[PDB]
DNA sequence: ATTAATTTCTTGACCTTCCCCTTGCTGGAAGGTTTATAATGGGAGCTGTCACGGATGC
């Protein structure tokens, strides 16, 4: 509905939600889990 | 129609740079990697540009 590429890069910025501190943590833990995920399954590989 | 003293040709025998390299650093240039308090909606015309078609919405 515009023509500039930033302004509608704002709009998909504003789409999703910022965090707070607690909402910082919680994507930090998230992404911990998501590492440790692969870290305890590439324990049942046998390379 | 002949050859003997000059005058060129050819061949070793010498003469330079170009470039890589000598041990031992010394400096310069190109490329990639962290740094761990707190950092969360950024920024910039310029119109005082006017009169056409080509596509959009009643």
């Given at each position: 509905?515009?023509?500039?590429?930033?302004?509608?890069?704002?709009?998909?910025?504003?789409?999703?939600e910022?965090?707070?501190?607690?909402?910082?943590?919680?994507?930090?833990?998230?992404?911990?889990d998501?590492?440790?995920?692969v870290?305890?399954?590439?324990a049942e590989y046998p390379?």
């Amino acid at each position: 509905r515009t023509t500039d590429p930033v302004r509608m890069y704002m709009r998909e910025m504003g789409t999703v939600e910022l965090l707070t501190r607690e909402g910082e943590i919680d994507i930090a833990k998230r992404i911990e889990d998501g590492i440790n995920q692969v870290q305890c399954s590439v324990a049942e590989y046998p390379e």
